[PDB]
Amino acid sequence: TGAVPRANRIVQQLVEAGADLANIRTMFRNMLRGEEMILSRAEQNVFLQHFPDMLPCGIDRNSELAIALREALRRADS
C-alpha cells in the first residue's frame, strides 16, 4: 500500500497502455509545475486511477505518490 509499489503499478499500467515513458516523464514534470498533461484516453485513465483529483486540482509535487512516481519514471527512463 506504500507509495513506491503504487508508483511502480502506475508505471506498469502506463506501459500496458502503450505509453512512451520518456514522454510521460517530461509531461509529469510539467504537470508538477502546473501545466496540464496531453494524454491519450488510456494514459489519462491510468492517471485518474491514482490521482483522482488531477483534472480540477492538479497534482501536488510534495505528495508521497507524486515523489515516488517522479523517482520511478526517472529510473525507468535512465
* Residue 35 contacts Cl ion per CB under 5 A: no
* Residue 77 contacts Cl ion per CB under 5 A: no
Q: Give the integer Cα–Cα distance in Å for 62 and 38.
A: 22
Interhelix angle 3-16/41-50, nearest 10 degrees: 170
Out of 16, 35, 64, 77, the residue judged to bind Cl ion by CB under 5 A:
64
Say if residues 73 and 21 touch (Cβ distance below 8 Å). Answer: yes
* Residue 40 contacts Cl ion per CB under 5 A: no
Site stretch for Cl ion (CB under 5 A), options 4-12, 17-25, 31-39, 46-54: 46-54
